[PDB]
Amino acid sequence: MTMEQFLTSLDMIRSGCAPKFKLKTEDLDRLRVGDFNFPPSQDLMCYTKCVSLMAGTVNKKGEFNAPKALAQLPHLVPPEMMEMSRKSVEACRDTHKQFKESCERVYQTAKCFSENADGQFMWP
């Protein structure tokens, strides 16, 4: 995937998930630039789960699958973002073990990616 394809994919992924929830545009804008520094609603957390299910990086119980995520990266991010993503997969692989509820498990993992990111992080 090229950078141009990646940037557009963010909108396409959002379109498959956002209609299932009641979400604020301002909250989606913040996640889009990797700013997870605000309290999320349950709907926003479950949105992150929907996006991750589409990516194949989590199961329906919200358990993050690090080997599978590493294998999926070429279908998720451009070459330019691979190393940063590999680094965040490793740093954030066990975050889900601290939570029991599936949407929360995914949201906290995504928040960890955003915080561990050593470059710009973008969420669909």
Could you tell me the residue range of the domain that residue 96 belongs to? 1-124
Q: Is 35 helix (H, G, I), strand (E, B) or coil?
A: coil
Question: Is 123 in contact with 34 (CB distance < 8 Å)?
Answer: yes
Is 57 marked as binding a ligand? yes
Task: State how far the Cα of 108 lies from the Cα of 89, in Å rounded to an integer.
Answer: 13
Approach to solving:
X-ray
Is 41 marked as binding a ligand? no
Domain containing residue 89: CATH number: 1.10.238.20
Task: State how far the Cα of 116 lies from the Cα of 40, in Å rounded to an integer.
Answer: 19
Give resolution in angstroms: 1.5
Distance of CA 35 to the CA centre of its chain: 12
Of 107, 116, 106, 121, give the one whose Cα is nearest residue 34.
121
Task: State how far the Cα of 99 lies from the Cα of 78, in Å rounded to an integer.
Answer: 30
Instruction: Write the burial class of residue 101 (CB in 10 Å: 0-12 exposed, 13-18 middle, 19+ buried).
Output: middle
Q: What's the structural domain count of the chain?
A: 1
